[PDB]
Design a protein around this ligand. Structure first.
Ligand code: NAI
Ligand code: NAI
Ligand code: HIO
Ligand code: HIO
Ligand code: MG
Ligand code: MG
Ligand code: MG
Ligand code: MG
Ligand code: MG
Ligand code: MG
Lengths: 331, 331
């Protein structure tokens, strides 16, 4: 399918418009600053006190030069109400702090399709509902913008009572320079499923488990953990950069013939058919709502699995030895 | 285990030594230029004509301002004869072109232990035998050096009849700035096995099979290949950059809580204990000489598996669509 770039998109429609960016975290910080840098009027909706403490994201937004309002006041003010809060808390915050401020002619915007896809938020009929979803972590998205490039993005329109929903959504992507990498138009559901799949199976789940297992195999065989860290973790960035630049082709050219042979002779013995079938099963659970139900129930129960996994992550030798090695860099 | 940095190593021994770099490819080009930039005297040993045509590596090294000799004359001139030719061709080139020029107390150096470890090259008793092995592809090694940093390295000594083998090896890594990231001392056999394992199971085989299988799963489920590319390949660099900078801890902080939950809930279902067991098996074939014999036999046969693999790689959709996408970026 077709990829839209700067040459395809008009950003003019944003001249008269205020974007209320709700949540100043990984995506909200990046997107609000890219938007502001591009001359768009932005206000931040944030919560001053969370769990009984000062919310550092409220203080940061202020310090970074934004108008910062309570979410309800931001919503009143925004022509686009762009929800960059954690997915698990959006439905409550939406019901309670956003919805009463919606009015015909506002657009409700997201950067992930989850809450609309799975019907955890069902907006009123007379608001536009759009998605601008970056295929990037927010910190790296901001740096791409600052380097004169951008990250790829997916754009979706669920409701269009204004007639202008698509044009607004695309214009935002252009203002954020995501068009420099490329935009794909899709549905809320499509983005939801691919994105859950990729993070679980490839980018976060897959990557981390691959590196951790390799690291463990070396250490359990008697290799020093520092050596396992350099081989399995530090060098991953250097190899991935070659793929990002020129595909497998470029990476395969630069590595030794020994390594290239090993890649093809042995890689598929490690990550074989069984992995691909497990990926299929995970994708099914994404598509059919089972994974969504699990995550909603997890959050309802006070995220005990997530809390325990975070504590266990930090105890792993890959993390303790990595932190010691990186702290000793002359960088 | 001790990691050596800049303050731990003295490179002054290289002051009156000439390094003959044999092969000006990914490693020879990077290493030669880092050494030359640090003020070390380097000569290139290369072959003017390969397969009946002008060898571009010969020309490039002339163009980059080196003295470029046939391998035999380069070996004569070098105090350090540093073999950065493809592993599979070193034994014949060593026997024919290098070995007769070896004199007592020269140092024979490698950047991978394979040929010494598996006894494909058996050096005379009266030369030092050293290894300076960067944990990095050569293009990214050169970039790190130009950026004021360095790549991690492994340093081994197999023979030390001069007494100065270790000092020379370490000095080389400091002059190439690898000490800025850090150097580990190890044996030739240790480097060989960890290196082979890492490229097979994690960095090249594992990484490429992980991304390819994810990409296929999406495309086979009806998602556009451009979408599968941005999700499974382009974003991988952005994620791995976080891990490289601050470990899994940093990455987990930046991704969404939805993604962090997915990572821990689902990742190990994709890449699980069965994968770890395959990794153990692959490591055993590396340690026991099976892999090494297969790669020798493959080369002796005219690399038909590697040729067939190259061809099929370049026909995969991940490669053809990725190339089309990357051509359309606007940096
Ligand atoms: N880079 C990423 O993290 C990516 C995120 N997404 C999507 O972007 C959206 C935002 O995600 P993130 O930036 O990771 O959010 P985040 O986890 O950084 O949260 C944003 C801000 O929400 C506030 N917040 C946190 N918990 C709260 C609560 N209980 N009540 C009120 N406010 C609270 C905090 O000030 C926080 O800084 C999500 O829909 C996510 O799926 C899309 C692409 C990538
Ligand atoms: N980045 C990498 O590619 C890494 C390589 N290594 C090791 O470095 C050493 C060098 O590997 P690479 O740089 O990949 O070598 P390469 O494959 O780039 O070969 C170096 C040069 O050797 C010459 N050459 C090629 N075939 C030849 C033949 N049949 N006869 C004569 N000369 C020939 C060509 O001019 C070529 O540029 C190996 O021991 C390898 O395991 C170590 C770390 C990483
Ligand atoms: C990997 C990560 C940045 N990502 O793309 C996400 O969609 C997420 O954080 O949810
Ligand atoms: C991954 C690759 C660059 N590597 O570290 C090697 O050992 C190789 O190219 O053989
Ligand atoms: Mg994503
Ligand atoms: Mg996501
Ligand atoms: Mg090659
Ligand atoms: Mg290696
Ligand atoms: Mg190798
Ligand atoms: Mg979080």
């Amino acid at each position: 399918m077709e990829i839209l770039h700067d040459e395809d998109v008009d950003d003019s429609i944003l001249r008269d418009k205020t974007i209320a960016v709700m949540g100043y975290g990984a995506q909200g910080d990046a997107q609000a600053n890219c938007l502001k840098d591009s001359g768009i009027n932005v206000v931040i909706g944030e919560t001053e006190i969370l769990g009984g403490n000062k919310n550092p994201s409220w203080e940061k937004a202020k310090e970074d030069g934004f108008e910062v309002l309570p979410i309800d006041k931001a919503a009143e003010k925004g022509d686009v109400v762009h929800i960059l809060l954690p997915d698990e808390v959006q439905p409550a915050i939406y019901e309670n702090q956003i919805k009463p401020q919606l009015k015909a002619g506002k657009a409700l915007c997201f950067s992930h399709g989850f809450n609309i896809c799975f019907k955890r938020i069902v907006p009123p009929e007379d608001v536009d509902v759009i998605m601008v979803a970056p295929k990037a972590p927010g910190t790296e998205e901001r740096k791409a913008y600052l380097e004169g490039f951008g990250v790829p993005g997916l754009v979706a329109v669920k409701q269009n009572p204004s007639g202008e929903a698509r044009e607004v959504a695309l214009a935002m992507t252009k203002a954020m320079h995501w068009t420099k990498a490329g935009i794909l138009e899709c549905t809320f559901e499509q983005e939801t499923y691919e994105d859950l799949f990729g993070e679980q199976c490839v980018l976060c789940g897959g990557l981390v488990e691959l590196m951790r297992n390799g690291f463990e195999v070396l250490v359990e065989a008697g290799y020093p953990p520092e050596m396992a860290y350099f081989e399995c973790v530090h060098e991953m960035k250097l190899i991935v950069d070659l793929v990002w630049q020129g595909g497998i082709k470029r990476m395969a050219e630069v590595i030794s013939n020994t390594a290239e042979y090993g890649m093809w002779a042995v890689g598929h013995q490690i990550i074989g058919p069984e992995v691909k079938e497990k990926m299929k099963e995970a994708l099914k659970r994404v598509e059919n709502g089972e994974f969504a139900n699990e995550w909603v129930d997890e959050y309802k129960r006070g995220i005990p699995f997530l809390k325990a996994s975070r504590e266990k992550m930090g105890e792993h030798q890959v993390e303790t030895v990595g932190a010691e090695i990186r702290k000793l860099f002359a960088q």
